[PDB]
Amino acid sequence: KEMPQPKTFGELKNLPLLNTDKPVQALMKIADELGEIFKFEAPGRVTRYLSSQRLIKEACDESRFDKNLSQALKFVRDFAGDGLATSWTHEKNWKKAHNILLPSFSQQAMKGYHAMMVDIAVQLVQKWERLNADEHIEVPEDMTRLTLDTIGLCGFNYRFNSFYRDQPHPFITSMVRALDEAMNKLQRAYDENKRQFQEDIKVMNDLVDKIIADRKASGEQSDDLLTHMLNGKDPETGEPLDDENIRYQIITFLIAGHETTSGLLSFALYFLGKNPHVLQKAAEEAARVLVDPVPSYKQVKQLKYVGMVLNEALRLWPTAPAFSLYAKEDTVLGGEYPLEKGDELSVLIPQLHRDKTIWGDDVEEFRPERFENPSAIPQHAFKPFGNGQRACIGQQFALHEATLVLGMMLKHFDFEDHTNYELDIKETLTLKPEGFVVKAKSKKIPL
Amino acid sequence: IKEMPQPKTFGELKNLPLLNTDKPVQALMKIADELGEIFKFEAPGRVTRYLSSQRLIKEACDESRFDKNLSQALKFVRDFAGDGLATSWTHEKNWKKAHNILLPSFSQQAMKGYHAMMVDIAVQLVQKWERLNADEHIEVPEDMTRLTLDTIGLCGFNYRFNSFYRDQPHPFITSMVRALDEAMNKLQRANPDDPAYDENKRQFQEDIKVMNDLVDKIIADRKASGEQSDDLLTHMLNGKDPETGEPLDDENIRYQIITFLIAGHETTSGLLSFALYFLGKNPHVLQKAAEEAARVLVDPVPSYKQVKQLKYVGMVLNEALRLWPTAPAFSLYAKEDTVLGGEYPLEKGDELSVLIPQLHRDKTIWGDDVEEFRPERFENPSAIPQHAFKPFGNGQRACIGQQFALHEATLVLGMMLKHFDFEDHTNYELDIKETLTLKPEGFVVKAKSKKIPL
Numbered sequence A: 001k002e003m004p005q006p007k008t009f010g011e012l013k014n015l016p017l018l019n020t021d022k023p024v025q026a027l028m029k030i031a032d033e034l035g036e037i038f039k040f041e042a043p044g045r046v047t048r049y050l051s052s053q054r055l056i057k058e059a060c061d062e063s064r065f066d067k068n069l070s071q072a073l074k075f076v077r078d079f080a081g082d083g084l085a086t087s088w089t090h091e092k093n094w095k096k097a098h099n100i101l102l103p104s105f106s107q108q109a110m111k112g113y114h115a116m117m118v119d120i121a122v123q124l125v126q127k128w129e130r131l132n133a134d135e136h137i138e139v140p141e142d143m144t145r146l147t148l149d150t151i152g153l154c155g156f157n158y159r160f161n162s163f164y165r166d167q168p169h170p171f172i173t174s175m176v177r178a179l180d181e182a183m184n185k186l187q188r189a190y191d192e193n194k195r196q197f198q199e200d201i202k203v204m205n206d207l208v209d210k211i212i213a214d215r216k217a218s219g220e221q222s223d224d225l226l227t228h229m230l231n232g233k234d235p236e237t238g239e240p241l242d243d244e245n246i247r248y249q250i251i252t253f254l255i256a257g258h259e260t261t262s263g264l265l266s267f268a269l270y271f272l273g274k275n276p277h278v279l280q281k282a283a284e285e286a287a288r289v290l291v292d293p294v295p296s297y298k299q300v301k302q303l304k305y306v307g308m309v310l311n312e313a314l315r316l317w318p319t320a321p322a323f324s325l326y327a328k329e330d331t332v333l334g335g336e337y338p339l340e341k342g343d344e345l346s347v348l349i350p351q352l353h354r355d356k357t358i359w360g361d362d363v364e365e366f367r368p369e370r371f372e373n374p375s376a377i378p379q380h381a382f383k384p385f386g387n388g389q390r391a392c393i394g395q396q397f398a399l400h401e402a403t404l405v406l407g408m409m410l411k412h413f414d415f416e417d418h419t420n421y422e423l424d425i426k427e428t429l430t431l432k433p434e435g436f437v438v439k440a441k442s443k444k445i446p447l
Numbered sequence B: 001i002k003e004m005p006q007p008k009t010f011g012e013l014k015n016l017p018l019l020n021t022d023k024p025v026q027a028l029m030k031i032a033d034e035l036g037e038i039f040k041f042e043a044p045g046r047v048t049r050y051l052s053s054q055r056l057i058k059e060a061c062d063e064s065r066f067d068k069n070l071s072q073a074l075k076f077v078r079d080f081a082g083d084g085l086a087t088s089w090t091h092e093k094n095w096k097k098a099h100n101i102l103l104p105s106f107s108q109q110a111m112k113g114y115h116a117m118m119v120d121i122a123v124q125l126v127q128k129w130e131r132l133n134a135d136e137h138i139e140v141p142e143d144m145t146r147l148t149l150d151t152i153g154l155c156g157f158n159y160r161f162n163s164f165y166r167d168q169p170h171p172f173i174t175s176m177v178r179a180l181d182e183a184m185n186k187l188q189r190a191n192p193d194d195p196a197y198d199e200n201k202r203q204f205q206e207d208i209k210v211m212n213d214l215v216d217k218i219i220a221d222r223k224a225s226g227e228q229s230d231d232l233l234t235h236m237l238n239g240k241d242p243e244t245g246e247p248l249d250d251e252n253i254r255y256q257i258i259t260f261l262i263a264g265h266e267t268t269s270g271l272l273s274f275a276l277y278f279l280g281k282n283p284h285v286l287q288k289a290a291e292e293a294a295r296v297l298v299d300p301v302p303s304y305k306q307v308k309q310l311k312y313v314g315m316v317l318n319e320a321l322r323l324w325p326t327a328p329a330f331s332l333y334a335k336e337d338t339v340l341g342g343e344y345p346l347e348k349g350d351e352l353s354v355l356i357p358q359l360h361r362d363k364t365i366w367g368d369d370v371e372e373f374r375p376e377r378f379e380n381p382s383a384i385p386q387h388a389f390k391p392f393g394n395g396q397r398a399c400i401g402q403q404f405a406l407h408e409a410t411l412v413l414g415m416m417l418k419h420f421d422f423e424d425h426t427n428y429e430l431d432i433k434e435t436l437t438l439k440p441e442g443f444v445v446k447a448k449s450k451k452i453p454l
């Protein structure tokens, strides 16, 4: 009835608890101590962190709660604008872009992207085939090279050529620095930060706008999201996306997809390395199914156990670990916690995924077999892709890409944990295993 | 590309007379021992291929290539189970509709609601055995069937068959068992329109009418009463398919009720019986199981949470399903032309039958000790290769009742071990009777009460 609350720091209330490298991990520990719900206060604001499937299923009721922009999303909005991920549900451009882009992201639409995903996957596999005996792989670094290049090519027929470099494409440099500035503002001479922030925004916009105008003037048609956006009309308003919003969407697809998908691949590879029984089943499937020198769309869909490995990695370490909601009207949560219109909730996805009343007593174990029967998972128990109409539009893209790439990696190599790597989870706006490195031993299967 | 072996033929009847035996599944297991992982089986008008290796069965379980087929047995059972979940094709509207409506009634969560009524019947079983005199013994499969039928009747439609109050079953049960028997016997009939069978046909129709009359009455009583229980019937009357917002019609509801009794009672009863048989043959396993039951079941009746902690008991049950899966076969058809195992080309529509007891004896999976009863094999699901263990079928057409069956069997086996030591007073020799399911015929024991009150 009265909600618990963690330790306070006088006038700063709970705010200094987030003054740390690893705030989500700090909140998970607080949730272990305090339970399914706790209040978090800061000067001028309040939120309530939810961890149980019991309360989170109510929060996922779209008639009672809508998406809120966290402070991080509000800062990212300075360069992602009113793109899909940083727009409010009630802004005209949210519904417009949603209606226009949903058909570009369906399971069916992945057939058109497949060839370009394969282009980048092959580049990754060739890079690793070409290492010398003495060398190792930096896993999150190479996964990020891959996911960025894949979203560039499928998104706007643009090659970042990340496997040709040590210093990224200037675009990527600016984007990563902008994200970093957005994140750093969350807990704050800064005139130089501000000048840099503006320059990085100008870099991102100049590139993207040029491409859009080149494509518009050329009239050429590709198998990309940019083409669908230029041809697309919203049935409701009858309008296409304006050129500016198109550019916010392109920036959005890079920011929203690349880092989360890269983290997923990295965690999956980490967990496979720690669970040889799971690795054996995954690798067997990859060998049996991927019988051609490059994978087909239909073959990726047959990688069922690989998909289960990916879902279990998202269970333990959902790479976009939180989403925020507000109460549409006065309402009572769980029969116990009255909320007023406008009150904020935050869903702690890693804690949801550790609800023992749902998953049983072995919640920290890596066991893909939990996902063997998709029907056995209760509704709202597993939410790595958010909720409802504001769920991840890129879900099918992310999973097709990760399934393809993890399948090819297992097909072509055995991986060795040559450093006895200790998991260290770095937090940006997403989660990834920092410093994860492996050595590969080629199975010598040609492409 | 190889040519598959085929067992001996009988002219016009092809391989059909091989199934004209008391124990057809056991006969097929012996054929599989002789011929290997795959063999063709022909009968007038039909062909199937029996699979026995995990190597081939993992491909057969690919839902993109193969879908559920109704075996000839399922086709005959469909005369009384209609388009209930077990006898419907995946592409019939009522399959997906009933599946969507009923899945929430069968979840691990939903078992909390059934627990009390499962306990009601389990207590009756325990009291029966506490009340035997010194001279007497237990008929195990008979008492397990009394239990499983009564449990599904009470949890399924708030109806008491009162099987522990009788020698001759409820008329419903008599008809159902006789219908199943007729369905089974038609499978081996070389001359099904011989006049000899006109009485079989008349009897079959009467038994169908008995089943339908009872069930339809209950449905209409409940509909007119408006009363709400903790049962499957209530969920079916209230339930709306999320896609369409439509409920099941009254007739399909009656097929589903007939289906739950047929599909759950016999298999679960067999599982309990085999588990008890194996515990009696493996004293070291019995000791661990009984130790767990005594340590976990600390109250006079078990709670839901306690049953979930009976982990070794659950492993015992999985190992019993390994050696003697009580629904021993399922059938598939090829969705399109495809090649099985890199060696056997199949055409669209071609049939496969998975011989589950033989899958479960694949030495390349389980090792050289495959005939030994070792529950410890199930300690880590990740160590088991894909599709090696299929007692509940496959994919979207897997057993909807799996959690129900295992909760019930875990509860009841836990209580039996808590309350009694069992004696193999006859040195019983395993004899496996075949209906459409498997059970140990004539298994009897004597119980010695531990005198622990309920």
Ligand code: HEM
Pocket (backbone or CB within 6 Å): A067, A084, A085, A098, A151, A252, A253, A256, A257, A258, A260, A261, A264, A318, A319, A320, A322, A323, A324, A384, A385, A386, A387, A389, A390, A391, A392, A393, A394, A395, A397, A398
């Ligand atoms: C494993 C990979 C991914 C994860 C875990 C993930 C997770 C999420 C989550 C949790 C949200 C909801 C955020 C909120 O409520 O505030 C979301 C939204 C979104 N994601 Fe992803 N995502 C992934 C990959 C991708 C990819 C590859 C793309 C694009 C190609 C993408 C584009 C988006 C967009 C546009 C939204 C906003 C949708 C809307 O509100 O209309 N994501 N994602």
Ligand code: HEM
Pocket (backbone or CB within 6 Å): B068, B085, B086, B087, B099, B152, B259, B260, B263, B264, B265, B267, B268, B271, B325, B326, B327, B329, B330, B331, B390, B391, B392, B393, B394, B396, B397, B398, B399, B400, B401, B402, B404, B405
């Ligand atoms: C140890 C006990 C049990 C075993 C071994 C077992 C086994 C199976 C198998 C192998 C199938 C698939 C059949 C096929 O592919 O043709 C199946 C389906 C089914 N079982 Fe069970 N079962 C058991 C208990 C139960 C119980 C207790 C219920 C109901 C309360 C039940 C209801 C069903 C239903 C309705 C289907 C059809 C599901 C569908 O296709 O949508 N079973 N069972």
Ligand SMILES: C1CNCN2CNCCNCN(CN1)CNCCNC2
Pocket (backbone or CB within 6 Å): B012, B190, B191
């Ligand atoms: C026609 C040939 N009948 C010869 N006999 C043996 N056939 C066994 C299978 N019978 C099924 N059909 C079809 N068989 C017709 N039954 C006729 C009686 N069987 C005699």
Ligand SMILES: [Cl-]
Pocket (backbone or CB within 6 Å): B190, B191, B192, B193, B194
């Ligand atoms: Cl005939």
Ligand SMILES: [Co+2]
Pocket (backbone or CB within 6 Å): none
């Ligand atoms: Co004949």
